[PDB]
DNA sequence: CTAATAAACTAAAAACTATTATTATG
DNA sequence: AATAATAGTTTTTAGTTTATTGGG
């Protein structure tokens, strides 16, 4: 939670997604409540600004997709908002949920992937 | 009551 | 919000002008 | 502009709407070379009513202008002349005007 | 800084709108009509800064991105300006209406899955810091979808999921003939009995224009108050009152409106050629000399300490007098940024303070380029309200002294007493004439006629809306109460002869 | 309409012998009329003021003859006061080794006055007197004079350098002499001053005395040729059945600069060299020019600006009536406070004037809105080029006269909610009891009042109310520098104003160690600029 | 006037460097513009927009006279504000972005104006001298030293005076960071000797400063400090 | 035998967020 | 390969314009 360093949240961002691909190993998932705790984290000033948020659902995400469906409308809602990689980072977390893939043609089409697919970078 | 300088 | 106008809730709740009404 | 009688004459397009938008009218204005201004300018002798408005009261109280209704307007227009003022649409008019009422007849 | 306010309004377009158990009483459609145009101008007298949106459902023809059928939205968020409301009063009246339905559609199947959803991206656009979620619906009957049970479930779960991110919406209680229940659809859906027949959602404050405006938290100054010389106090100087006015000419030209530059230029009068600034002399010509100086030091003697406060000493409250008041008095509150620790420091002072009843008499300089004034700080408490909430604030209210040169002469007035009958005249006259005070109930009628004006001529109103002019007694009950008083003190003092002029 | 004071001066070389360690009373002396004079020239006051001057080497007075009325010169006559006169007070006055009895030197500036009170309107006469008391002198026309001033209307004051009866300090709040360092013949010369005018004026004779010191640093200076600020006569109404005429005054009028700085040339020293105009032209295209009247003006609507000139807002608004005063209701006294006193200026209102019935009836007004403990609302306008206003008026009792005082009340559109949080509520900043303690002992040591004895009234150790704007002071300072120093550098500031700004350092010296405790007691951080 | 203007500013800039002296003439009407454009007595636009001086600074034209006199005018101001604001008596001995505009505008100007006829140069000069501190980017104490490497003939018999202080001033600005502060103080320090050298060759008392201050700090130098001492 | 005086009227300067080049590292 | 002044918004605001009485 501590904000001084972008690399105190990234390396524990790191870290927990590396737990949540491996409490148990995925054997087992007892722990669920840990993963609760660390929701709530990000609800726990990061479902105001949501800067780091989207960084710390990004390392949380790619090794632990079922995460982000808590904050899908959240991650659409944000979008507009960010114009650097931030749009990258939210555009691998909602790649990382084919479990989350119900229905986003909707939404992206409402949220304009018109301009980031048009918007050209590699 | 001034008066003077002081007035 | 109490005690907040629902118009501009954080702005303080108005109240109706009443002038002077002698008693 | 294709009828120069038009030209010349100024209108402060002010309240206009009673059956004809704002904007339809500015567009027959300028096709028709009348002038147009959104507040009173230094040429001002004619000022277009179509609603009440306090602007437009501030403008009655004033003897400066005159209370066109746009029909009025339109009747010239479709008529390809300009008519002079006779009082079937008139409130406040300019000092002359009152002197064409006179020549033309009493009040 | 703090976020802003979304205002989210959405009106149903469908018969139950359109239609009361007395259509006397303007419709729901209708009625929401005046709401909305009452917040639009109040919004536009107090905080228009913030962005404001107008859209519908029900309505068979439909407009917005995601293209959900029957959901037609009009205005995206937005500052009321008058297109808005113009175009918001033709639908105004029970014949707008009928309007609406001929060029609008009224009446088809929606789902709330698609409003939320709309509303959701709509909210997503802005680009904004944002503090408040507020959305207000339109609608008569709570059921609609609760008839469809996957339509009601799929509805409370977006619903439940825009709280969660903070989107928060409000009920609207609407007049219905049949009721507009609440514990039935709502109470479960919306974030926070009758069956609210009636419509009565704080809708008479909605309609209650409001002639008020304050700025969203901004901080005044924020000073350092030096003990002796090197102890250091933060503080926050505030005001819970700040005198307000009419907006200044915003000059425009009169052929465009476009705000015309205004560049004025000082010149030589012997060449015509602009003066610069070194051409130009401070002069102040006393007795037959011209005393030539410049502004540098001319501010350098209209500044004379730094922006901060040096304390003078202690002192109980009586050694003041209640004619001496120099400027009206500000409130200071303790600031734990420039000095940490600061606050149990100041409620250590502001409890000893109280118990000796000392003032803290201060040498106060606000900012640079101004004099260091003479300022008497008193303990502000904390006052609680029977909610709790403080009504005033704990801290310092700061008064402010004048000086010798300051404070004109008085001629030498007579002091002839009046005999106590005519004492008991005048109690017995107040005693009639007693009521508590309230500042919300004063205003400026010049003021208010003003923003009325502005208003109405702007809404292109036949008439502006007339003033209150509350700076002014009732006569009727002033006679009422005072009836005899008034001539028997007359003839206690006056000459029934000698009125007091002439 | 003017008034004929004069000064009567002492120039001996007693007072220009400084005691060390105490201000010369001559250089006090002159500190005085330098300060006077440069408030009487900078006002640029009409009364006439003259001057006469004993205890000097040089005699050119109307009245010689020997023995008396000598030694005793006479400079500047009933005349406007100028920067000469500034030049003749630090140039002429000089230490004069010749001493004479100040009484001939009364009747001197007597003669003078008389001289030159006639052809010339007098609204005042007076003449002062500038001692040490300890020059040489014979008290011989003291009751003469005293029967020459009852037959003459002039009126007196004798300053000391010593004081009537804190840091020592001169201008400021503290000892300015020995309490007890005045010799026999200034003992004598006070009991001499005390009779003289205990036989002129009556008890406030001693209230008559005063000293350089507090001179230096107060504006008393300017009394009693002043002439209080412009009424406002009008009329008080109270409903629709009564109406009583008025003369408000006001008391607190916060002083402004009577000169603003005209801009004139560099080149030739003119505001008439300084012509200036302003162009409206168009915002863009290169600058297009508009009328003066093509530019009309427009207000903030909502989302956009509306044209709205202001002859359509005058031509229908509220407009007051005038100098109308007119009551609205009345309220408890509990329910205003100081952060409700709206405005500037403090309304010291006052009844119809010579109107004794209004004497009678704003009497019962006193006593009873003092006994109901009761406020009144009053919607008062200046003009009719002033818009209303609302105020609270409440009584104010003087020990000569009882009066009401009006100030203006804030309306809706004044308040501002302005959110705050509860300190009590900071447990992590609960205020510790050691800490608590430390601070009640440095109030005790830092508190500026003195629980004045054998009375029941208690004092202020820096009453600053009565002490004028000290930046008028090194204002008129450097004004008359750079008037006679345009070349040289403004002078820096006087140590007075420092003296009169500063508190009495004793009541810091008892902090001293209250200051250490709170020092230890509490952290305070600080952030650097 | 915002960014949009800093950008047209210095876009016009780079213009009369790239291309001058070819229509670079139709430029004294713009130049009279701007001067009366910022002789405006609201003068509101920000110290950052101020490298208007390096524009009013002026080489692609001919200099008509017109320029040349209104310059004088441009030197009093700017002297009037470096001694306002140079002084801690506004409550800063701070230029934020005016003094090194004014140094590039009187590089483009001085060129053609102001040599060492009159007093007014030792004025300009006191200015300098006092070049504190600049927080990290050292851009006005490096651009007074290129400034003066341009125009320092035009400030000789004023600087045989002070021969240590400006000595070491040189030497601690070339003995900085931020390099371009070397590289200028260098480019100052070796036209000071070259003028110092002509003075000593043209005064009957070189014997005097010789065995007083050149021999001196030559023994006494004995990185770039030898390099120096023999180019000295 | 002409005369201050608030008042509304400008300027006008300062505080209030508020991003944003900038070394340091490579 | 990062952090740090830093101008861009409000907020009064001291001189300025009107005139309105108060003399003279």
Same mark, same amino acid.
């Given at each position: 939670?501590?904000?001084?360093?972008?690399? !105190?949240?990234?390396?524990?961002?790191?870290?927990?997604?590396?737990?949540?691909?491996?409490?148990?190993?995925?054997?087992?998932?007892?722990?669920?409540?840990?993963?609760?705790?660390?929701?709530?984290?990000? &609800?726990?000033?990061?479902?105001?600004?949501?800067?780091?948020?989207?960084?710390?659902?990004?390392? !949380?995400?790619?090794?632990?997709?079922?995460?982000?469906?808590?904050?899908?409308?959240?991650?659409?809602?944000?979008?507009?908002?960010?114009?650097?990689?931030?749009?990258?980072?939210?555009?691998?977390?909602?790649?990382?949920?084919?479990?989350?893939?119900?229905?986003?043609?909707?939404?992206?089409?409402?949220?304009?992937?018109?301009?980031? =697919?048009?918007?050209?970078?590699? | 009551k001034p008066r003077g300088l002081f007035s | 919000?109490?005690?907040?106008?629902?118009?501009?809730?954080?702005?303080?709740?108005?109240?109706?002008?009443?002038?002077?009404?002698?008693? | 502009?294709?009828?120069?009688?038009?030209?010349?004459?100024?209108?402060?397009?002010? %309240?206009?709407?009673?059956?004809?938008?704002?904007?339809?009218?500015?567009?027959?204005?300028?096709?028709?070379?009348?002038?147009?201004?959104?507040?009173?300018?230094?040429?001002?002798?004619?000022?277009?009513?179509? %609603?009440?408005?306090?602007?437009?009261?501030?403008?009655?109280?004033?003897?400066?202008?005159?209370?066109?209704?746009?029909?009025?307007?339109?009747?010239?227009?479709?008529?390809?002349?300009?008519?002079?003022?006779?009082?079937?649409?008139?409130?406040?008019?300019?000092?002359?005007?009152?002197?064409?009422?006179?020549?033309?007849?009493?009040? | 800084?703090?976020?802003?306010?979304?205002?989210?309004?959405?009106?149903?377009?469908?018969?139950?709108?359109?239609?009361?158990?007395?259509?006397?009483?303007?419709?729901?459609?209708?009625?929401?009509?005046?709401?909305?145009?009452?917040?639009?101008?109040?919004?536009?007298?107090?905080?228009?800064?913030?962005?404001?949106?107008? !859209?519908?459902?029900?309505?068979?023809?439909?407009?917005?991105?995601?293209?959900?059928?029957?959901?037609?939205?009009?205005?995206?968020?937005?500052?009321?300006?008058?297109?808005?409301?113009?175009?918001?009063?033709?639908?105004?009246?029970?014949?707008?209406?009928?309007?609406? /339905?001929?060029?609008?559609?009224?009446?088809?199947?929606?789902?709330?899955?698609?409003?939320?959803?709309?509303?959701?991206?709509?909210?997503?656009?802005?680009?904004?810091?944002?503090?408040?979620?507020?959305?207000?619906?339109?609608?008569?009957?709570?059921? @609609?979808?609760?008839?469809?049970?996957?339509?009601?479930?799929?509805?409370?779960?977006?619903?439940?999921?825009?709280?969660?991110?903070?989107?928060?919406?409000?009920?609207?209680?609407?007049?219905? @003939?049949?009721?507009?229940? *609440?514990?039935?659809?709502?109470?479960?859906?919306?974030?926070?009995?009758?069956?609210?027949?009636?419509?009565?959602?704080?809708?008479?404050?909605?309609?209650?224009?409001?002639?008020?405006?304050?700025?969203?938290?901004?901080?005044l100054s924020?000073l350092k108050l030096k003990?002796?010389?090197?102890?250091?106090?933060?503080?926050?100087i505030?005001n819970?009152?700040q005198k307000?006015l009419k907006?200044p000419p915003?000059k425009?030209?009169?052929?465009?409106?476009?705000?015309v530059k205004t560049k004025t230029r000082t010149f030589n009068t012997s060449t015509g050629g602009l003066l610069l600034p070194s051409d130009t002399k401070r002069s102040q010509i006393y007795g037959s000399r011209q005393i030539i100086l410049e502004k540098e030091e001319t501010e350098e003697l209209k500044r004379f300490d730094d922006p901060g406060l040096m304390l003078m000493?202690?002192?109980?409250?009586?050694?003041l007098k209640?004619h001496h008041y120099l400027r009206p008095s500000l409130?200071?509150?303790?600031?734990?940024?420039?000095?940490?620790?600061?606050?149990?420091?100041?409620?250590?002072?502001?409890?000893?303070?109280?118990?000796?009843?000392?003032?803290?008499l201060c040498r106060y300089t606000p900012r640079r380029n101004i004099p260091p004034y003479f300022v008497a700080?008193?303990?502000?408490?904390?006052?609680?309200?029977?909610?709790?909430?403080?009504?005033?604030?704990?801290?310092?209210?700061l008064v402010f002294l004048p000086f010798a040169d300051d404070k004109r002469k008085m001629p030498f007035?007579?002091?002839?007493?009046?005999?106590?009958?005519?004492?008991?005249?005048?109690?017995?006259?107040?005693?009639?004439?007693?009521?508590?005070?309230?500042?919300?109930?004063?205003?400026?009628?010049?003021?208010?006629?003003?923003?009325?004006? #502005?208003?109405? #001529?702007?809404?292109?109103?036949?008439?502006?809306?007339?003033?209150?002019?509350?700076?002014?007694?009732?006569?009727?009950?002033?006679?009422?109460?005072?009836?005899?008083?008034?001539?028997?003190?007359?003839?206690?003092?006056?000459?029934?002869?000698?009125? @007091?002029?002439? | 309409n003017k008034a004929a004071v004069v000064l009567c001066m002492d120039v001996?070389?007693?007072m220009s012998?400084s005691?060390?360690?105490?201000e010369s009373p001559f250089e006090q002396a002159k500190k005085v009329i330098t300060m006077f004079v440069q408030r009487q020239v900078f006002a640029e006051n009409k009364d006439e003021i003259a001057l006469v001057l004993?205890?000097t080497?040089?005699?050119?007075?109307?009245? %010689?003859?020997?023995?008396?009325?000598?030694?005793?010169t006479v400079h500047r006559h009933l005349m406007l006061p100028d920067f000469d006169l500034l030049e003749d007070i630090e140039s002429k006055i000089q230490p004069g080794? /010749?001493?004479?009895?100040?009484?001939?030197?009364?009747?001197?500036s007597?003669?003078v006055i008389?001289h030159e009170t006639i052809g010339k309107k007098f609204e005042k006469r007076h003449i002062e007197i500038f001692?040490?008391?300890?020059?040489?002198?014979?008290?011989?026309?003291?009751?003469?004079?005293?029967?020459?001033? &009852?037959?003459?209307?002039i009126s007196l004051q004798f300053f000391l350098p010593?004081?009537?009866?804190?840091?020592?300090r001169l201008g400021g709040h503290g000892?300015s002499? @020995?309490?007890?360092?005045?010799?026999?013949?200034?003992?004598?010369?006070?009991?001499?001053?005390?009779?003289? =005018?205990?036989?002129?004026?009556?008890?406030?004779?001693?209230?008559?005395?005063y000293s350089f010191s507090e001179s230096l640093r107060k504006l008393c200076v300017f009394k009693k040729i002043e002439r209080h600020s412009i009424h406002w006569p009008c009329?008080?109404?109270?409903?629709?059945?009564?109406?009583?005429?008025?003369a408000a005054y006001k008391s607190i009028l916060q002083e402004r600069v009577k000169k603003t700085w005209t801009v004139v040339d560099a080149k030739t020293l003119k505001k008439e060299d300084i012509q200036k105009e302003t162009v409206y032209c168009?915002?863009?295209?290169?600058?297009?020019?508009?009328?003066k009247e093509?530019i *009309?003006q427009?207000?903030?609507?909502?989302?956009?600006?509306?044209?709205?000139?202001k002859?359509?807002?005058?031509?229908?608004?509220?407009?007051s009536?005038g100098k109308?005063?007119?009551?609205?209701?009345?309220?408890?006294?509990?329910?205003?406070?100081?952060?409700?006193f709206m405005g500037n200026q403090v309304l010291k209102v006052?009844?119809?004037?010579?109107?004794?019935?209004?004497?009678?009836? #704003?009497?019962?007004?006193?006593?009873?809105?003092?006994?109901?403990?009761?406020?009144?609302?009053?919607?008062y306008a200046y003009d009719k080029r002033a818009n209303?206003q609302?105020?609270?008026?409440?009584?104010? *009792?003087?020990?000569?006269?009882?009066?009401?005082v009006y100030v203006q009340?804030?309306?809706?559109?004044?308040?501002?909610?302005?959110?705050? %949080?509860?300190?009590?509520?900071? &447990?992590?900043?609960?205020?510790?009891?050691?800490?608590?303690?430390?601070?009640?002992?440095?109030?005790?040591?830092?508190?500026?009042?003195?629980?004045?004895? &054998?009375?029941?009234?208690?004092?202020?150790?820096f009453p600053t109310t009565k002490i004028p704007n000290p930046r008028f002071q090194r204002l008129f300072q450097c004004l008359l520098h750079r008037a006679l120093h345009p070349r040289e550098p403004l002078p820096p500031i006087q140590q007075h104003i420092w003296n009169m700004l500063n508190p009495?350092?004793?009541?810091?010296?008892?902090?001293?160690?209250?200051?250490?405790?709170?020092?230890?007691?509490?952290?305070?951080?600080?952030?650097?600029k | 006037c915002?960014?949009?203007?800093?950008?047209?500013?210095?876009?016009?800039?780079?213009?009369?460097?790239?291309?001058?002296?070819?229509?670079?003439?139709?430029?004294?009407?713009?130049?009279s513009?701007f001067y009366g454009e910022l002789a405006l007595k609201k003068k509101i636009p920000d110290t950052?927009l101020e490298?208007v001086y390096?524009?009013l600074?002026?080489?692609?034209?001919?200099?008509?006279?017109? =320029?040349?006199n209104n310059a004088e005018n441009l030197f009093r101001a700017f002297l009037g504000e470096l001694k306002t604001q140079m002084t801690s008596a506004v409550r800063e001995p701070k230029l934020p972005v005016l003094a090194?505009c004014l140094?590039?505008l009187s590089?483009?100007?001085?060129?053609?104006?102001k040599?060492?006829?009159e007093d007014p140069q030792t004025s300009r000069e006191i200015f300098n001298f006092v070049? /504190?501190?600049?927080?990290?980017?050292?851009?006005?104490?490096?651009?007074?030293?290129?400034?003066?490497?341009?125009?320092?003939?035009?400030?000789?018999?004023?600087?045989?005076?002070?021969?240590?202080?400006?000595?070491?001033?040189?030497?601690?600005?070339?003995?900085?960071?931020?390099?371009?502060?070397?590289?200028?103080?260098?480019?100052?320090?070796?036209?000071?000797?070259?003028?110092?050298?002509?003075?000593?060759?043209?005064?009957?008392?070189?014997?005097?400063?010789?065995?007083?201050?050149?021999?001196? /700090?030559?023994?006494?130098?004995?990185?770039?400090?030898?390099?120096?001492?023999?180019?000295?």
């Amino acid at each position: 939670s501590f904000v001084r360093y972008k690399e !105190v949240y990234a390396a524990a961002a790191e870290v927990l997604g590396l737990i949540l691909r491996y409490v148990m190993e995925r054997k087992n998932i007892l722990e669920e409540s840990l993963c609760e705790l660390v929701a709530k984290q990000l &609800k726990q000033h990061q479902n105001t600004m949501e800067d780091k948020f989207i960084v710390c659902l990004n390392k !949380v995400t790619k090794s632990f997709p079922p995460l982000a469906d808590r904050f899908m409308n959240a991650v659409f809602f944000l979008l507009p908002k960010f114009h650097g990689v931030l749009k990258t980072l939210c555009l691998e977390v909602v790649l990382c949920r084919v479990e989350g893939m119900t229905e986003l043609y909707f939404q992206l089409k409402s949220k304009d992937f018109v301009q980031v =697919m048009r918007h050209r970078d590699d | 009551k001034p008066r003077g300088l002081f007035s | 919000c109490p005690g907040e106008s629902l118009i501009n809730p954080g702005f303080k709740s108005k109240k109706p002008a009443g002038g002077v009404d002698f008693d | 502009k294709i009828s120069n009688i038009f030209e010349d004459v100024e209108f402060c397009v002010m %309240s206009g709407t009673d059956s004809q938008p704002k904007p339809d009218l500015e567009n027959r204005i300028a096709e028709f070379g009348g002038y147009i201004v959104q507040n009173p300018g230094p040429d001002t002798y004619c000022v277009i009513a179509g %609603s009440e408005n306090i602007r437009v009261k501030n403008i009655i109280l004033s003897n400066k202008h005159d209370v066109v209704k746009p029909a009025w307007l339109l009747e010239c227009f479709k008529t390809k002349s300009f008519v002079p003022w006779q009082p079937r649409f008139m409130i406040h008019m300019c000092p002359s005007t009152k002197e064409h009422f006179a020549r033309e007849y009493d009040c | 800084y703090s976020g802003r306010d979304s205002l989210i309004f959405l009106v149903d377009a469908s018969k139950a709108m359109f239609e009361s158990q007395s259509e006397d009483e303007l419709t729901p459609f209708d009625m929401s009509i005046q709401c909305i145009q009452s917040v639009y101008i109040s919004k536009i007298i107090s905080s228009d800064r913030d962005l404001l949106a107008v !859209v519908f459902y029900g309505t068979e023809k439909d407009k917005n991105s995601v293209n959900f059928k029957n959901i037609y939205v009009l205005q995206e968020l937005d500052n009321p300006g008058a297109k808005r409301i113009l175009e918001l009063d033709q639908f105004k009246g029970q014949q707008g209406q009928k309007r609406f /339905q001929d060029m609008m559609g009224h009446g088809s199947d929606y789902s709330l899955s698609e409003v939320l959803w709309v509303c959701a991206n709509l909210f997503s656009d802005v680009q904004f810091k944002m503090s408040h979620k507020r959305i207000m619906l339109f609608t008569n009957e709570d059921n @609609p979808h609760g008839n469809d049970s996957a339509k009601a479930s799929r509805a409370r779960t977006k619903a439940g999921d825009l709280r969660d991110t903070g989107i928060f919406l409000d009920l609207m209680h609407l007049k219905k @003939p049949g009721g507009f229940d *609440i514990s039935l659809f709502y109470r479960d859906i919306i974030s926070i009995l009758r069956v609210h027949f009636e419509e009565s959602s704080k809708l008479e404050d909605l309609l209650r224009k409001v002639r008020a405006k304050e700025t969203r938290k901004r901080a005044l100054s924020r000073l350092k108050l030096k003990l002796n010389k090197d102890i250091v106090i933060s503080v926050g100087i505030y005001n819970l009152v700040q005198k307000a006015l009419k907006p200044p000419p915003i000059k425009l030209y009169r052929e465009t409106n476009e705000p015309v530059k205004t560049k004025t230029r000082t010149f030589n009068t012997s060449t015509g050629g602009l003066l610069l600034p070194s051409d130009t002399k401070r002069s102040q010509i006393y007795g037959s000399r011209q005393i030539i100086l410049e502004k540098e030091e001319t501010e350098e003697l209209k500044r004379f300490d730094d922006p901060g406060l040096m304390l003078m000493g202690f002192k109980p409250l009586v050694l003041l007098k209640k004619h001496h008041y120099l400027r009206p008095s500000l409130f200071v509150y303790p600031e734990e940024s420039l000095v940490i620790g600061s606050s149990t420091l100041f409620s250590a002072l502001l409890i000893k303070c109280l118990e000796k009843e000392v003032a803290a008499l201060c040498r106060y300089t606000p900012r640079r380029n101004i004099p260091p004034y003479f300022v008497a700080l008193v303990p502000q408490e904390e006052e609680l309200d029977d909610q709790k909430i403080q009504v005033t604030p704990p801290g310092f209210q700061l008064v402010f002294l004048p000086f010798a040169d300051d404070k004109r002469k008085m001629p030498f007035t007579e002091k002839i007493m009046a005999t106590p009958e005519q004492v008991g005249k005048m109690k017995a006259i107040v005693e009639k004439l007693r009521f508590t005070y309230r500042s919300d109930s004063f205003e400026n009628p010049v003021l208010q006629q003003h923003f009325r004006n #502005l208003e109405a #001529l702007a809404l292109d109103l036949m008439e502006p809306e007339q003033a209150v002019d509350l700076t002014l007694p009732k006569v009727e009950a002033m006679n009422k109460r005072l009836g005899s008083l008034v001539d028997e003190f007359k003839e206690l003092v006056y000459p029934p002869d000698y009125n @007091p002029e002439g | 309409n003017k008034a004929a004071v004069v000064l009567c001066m002492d120039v001996g070389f007693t007072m220009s012998n400084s005691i060390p360690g105490i201000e010369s009373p001559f250089e006090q002396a002159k500190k005085v009329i330098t300060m006077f004079v440069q408030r009487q020239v900078f006002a640029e006051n009409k009364d006439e003021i003259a001057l006469v001057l004993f205890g000097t080497d040089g005699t050119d007075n109307p009245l %010689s003859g020997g023995d008396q009325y000598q030694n005793i010169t006479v400079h500047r006559h009933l005349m406007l006061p100028d920067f000469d006169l500034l030049e003749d007070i630090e140039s002429k006055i000089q230490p004069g080794s /010749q001493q004479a009895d100040f009484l001939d030197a009364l009747i001197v500036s007597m003669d003078v006055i008389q001289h030159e009170t006639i052809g010339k309107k007098f609204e005042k006469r007076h003449i002062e007197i500038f001692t040490d008391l300890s020059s040489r002198f014979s008290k011989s026309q003291l009751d003469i004079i005293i029967h020459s001033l &009852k037959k003459c209307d002039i009126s007196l004051q004798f300053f000391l350098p010593f004081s009537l009866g804190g840091p020592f300090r001169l201008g400021g709040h503290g000892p300015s002499f @020995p309490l007890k360092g005045i010799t026999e013949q200034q003992k004598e010369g006070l009991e001499i001053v005390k009779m003289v =005018m205990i036989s002129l004026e009556g008890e406030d004779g001693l209230d008559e005395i005063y000293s350089f010191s507090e001179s230096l640093r107060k504006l008393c200076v300017f009394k009693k040729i002043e002439r209080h600020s412009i009424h406002w006569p009008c009329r008080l109404t109270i409903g629709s059945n009564l109406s009583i005429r008025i003369a408000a005054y006001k008391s607190i009028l916060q002083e402004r600069v009577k000169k603003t700085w005209t801009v004139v040339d560099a080149k030739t020293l003119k505001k008439e060299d300084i012509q200036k105009e302003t162009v409206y032209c168009l915002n863009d295209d290169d600058e297009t020019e508009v009328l003066k009247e093509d530019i *009309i003006q427009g207000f903030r609507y909502g989302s956009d600006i509306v044209p709205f000139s202001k002859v359509d807002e005058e031509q229908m608004k509220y407009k007051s009536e005038g100098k109308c005063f007119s009551v609205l209701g009345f309220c408890k006294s509990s329910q205003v406070q100081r952060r409700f006193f709206m405005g500037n200026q403090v309304l010291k209102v006052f009844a119809a004037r010579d109107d004794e019935a209004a004497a009678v009836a #704003l009497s019962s007004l006193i006593h009873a809105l003092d006994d109901l403990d009761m406020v009144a609302i009053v919607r008062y306008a200046y003009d009719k080029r002033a818009n209303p206003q609302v105020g609270v008026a409440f009584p104010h *009792i003087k020990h000569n006269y009882e009066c009401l005082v009006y100030v203006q009340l804030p309306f809706m559109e004044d308040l501002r909610q302005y959110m705050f %949080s509860s300190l009590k509520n900071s &447990k992590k900043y609960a205020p510790t009891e050691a800490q608590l303690n430390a601070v009640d002992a440095l109030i005790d040591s830092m508190s500026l009042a003195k629980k004045d004895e &054998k009375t029941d009234t208690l004092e202020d150790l820096f009453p600053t109310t009565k002490i004028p704007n000290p930046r008028f002071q090194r204002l008129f300072q450097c004004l008359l520098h750079r008037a006679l120093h345009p070349r040289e550098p403004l002078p820096p500031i006087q140590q007075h104003i420092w003296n009169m700004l500063n508190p009495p350092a004793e009541v810091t010296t008892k902090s001293q160690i209250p200051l250490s405790k709170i020092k230890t007691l509490f952290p305070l951080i600080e952030a650097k600029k | 006037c915002k960014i949009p203007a800093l950008d047209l500013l210095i876009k016009l800039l780079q213009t009369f460097r790239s291309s001058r002296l070819m229509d670079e003439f139709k430029i004294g009407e713009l130049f009279s513009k701007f001067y009366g454009e910022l002789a405006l007595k609201k003068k509101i636009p920000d110290t950052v927009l101020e490298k208007v001086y390096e524009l009013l600074g002026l080489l692609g034209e001919v200099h008509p006279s017109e =320029m040349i006199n209104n310059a004088e005018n441009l030197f009093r101001a700017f002297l009037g504000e470096l001694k306002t604001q140079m002084t801690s008596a506004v409550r800063e001995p701070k230029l934020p972005v005016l003094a090194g505009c004014l140094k590039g505008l009187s590089s483009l100007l001085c060129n053609f104006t102001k040599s060492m006829e009159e007093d007014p140069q030792t004025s300009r000069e006191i200015f300098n001298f006092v070049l /504190q501190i600049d927080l990290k980017r050292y851009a006005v104490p490096s651009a007074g030293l290129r400034l003066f490497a341009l125009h320092a003939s035009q400030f000789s018999t004023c600087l045989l005076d002070n021969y240590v202080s400006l000595f070491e001033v040189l030497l601690k600005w070339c003995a900085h960071t931020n390099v371009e502060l070397k590289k200028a103080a260098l480019s100052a320090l070796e036209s000071f000797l070259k003028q110092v050298s002509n003075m000593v060759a043209k005064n009957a008392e070189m014997h005097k400063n010789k065995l007083q201050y050149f021999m001196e /700090q030559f023994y006494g130098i004995i990185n770039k400090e030898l390099s120096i001492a023999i180019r000295g």
